[PDB]
Amino acid sequence: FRINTNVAALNAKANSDLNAKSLDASLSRLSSGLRINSAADDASGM
Protein backbone atom coordinates (compact mmCIF):
# COMPACT_ATOMS: atom_id res chain seq x y z
CA PHE A 1 0.00 0.00 0.00
CA ARG A 2 3.13 2.14 0.01
CA ILE A 3 3.49 4.22 -3.13
CA ASN A 4 6.65 5.49 -4.92
CA THR A 5 8.01 1.93 -5.21
CA ASN A 6 5.34 0.11 -7.23
CA VAL A 7 6.49 -3.52 -7.21
CA ALA A 8 3.75 -5.08 -9.31
CA ALA A 9 4.76 -2.68 -12.08
CA LEU A 10 8.35 -3.91 -12.03
CA ASN A 11 7.27 -7.55 -11.92
CA ALA A 12 4.85 -7.16 -14.82
CA LYS A 13 7.46 -5.27 -16.83
CA ALA A 14 10.04 -8.01 -16.28
CA ASN A 15 7.62 -10.71 -17.39
CA SER A 16 6.39 -8.79 -20.43
CA ASP A 17 9.94 -8.05 -21.57
CA LEU A 18 10.92 -11.70 -21.17
CA ASN A 19 7.95 -12.52 -23.39
CA ALA A 20 8.72 -9.84 -25.98
CA LYS A 21 12.16 -11.41 -26.37
CA SER A 22 10.54 -14.70 -27.39
CA LEU A 23 8.04 -12.97 -29.66
CA ASP A 24 10.92 -11.25 -31.45
CA ALA A 25 12.83 -14.52 -31.78
CA SER A 26 9.84 -16.37 -33.23
CA LEU A 27 9.19 -13.51 -35.64
CA SER A 28 12.78 -13.58 -36.86
CA ARG A 29 12.53 -17.32 -37.43
CA LEU A 30 9.25 -16.87 -39.31
CA SER A 31 10.89 -14.24 -41.51
CA SER A 32 14.22 -15.84 -42.35
CA GLY A 33 12.79 -19.34 -42.66
CA LEU A 34 15.61 -20.90 -40.64
CA ARG A 35 15.46 -22.48 -37.19
CA ILE A 36 19.04 -21.47 -36.38
CA ASN A 37 19.79 -17.88 -37.41
CA SER A 38 22.36 -16.46 -35.01
CA ALA A 39 23.92 -19.88 -34.25
CA ALA A 40 23.50 -18.98 -30.57
CA ASP A 41 20.34 -21.09 -30.29
CA ASP A 42 22.20 -24.27 -31.33
CA ALA A 43 25.96 -24.73 -31.12
CA SER A 44 26.53 -28.14 -32.70
CA GLY A 45 23.43 -28.04 -34.85
CA MET A 46 25.16 -25.24 -36.73
Residue 38: CB minimum distance to its own copies, A: 10
Q: Is 32 in the site for its own copies (CB under 8 A)?
A: yes
**Chain centroid, CA 11 distance in Å:** 15
What are the distances in angstroms from CA 29 to CA 3, 11, 13? 41, 28, 24
Binding mask 27-46 for other proteins (x = CB under 8 A): x-xx--xxxx-xxx----x-
* DSSP sequence for 3-16: -SS-HHHHHHHHHH
Tell me which residues touch other proteins (CB under 8 A).
Answer: 1-13, 15-17, 19-20, 22-23, 26-27, 29-30, 33-36, 38-40, 45
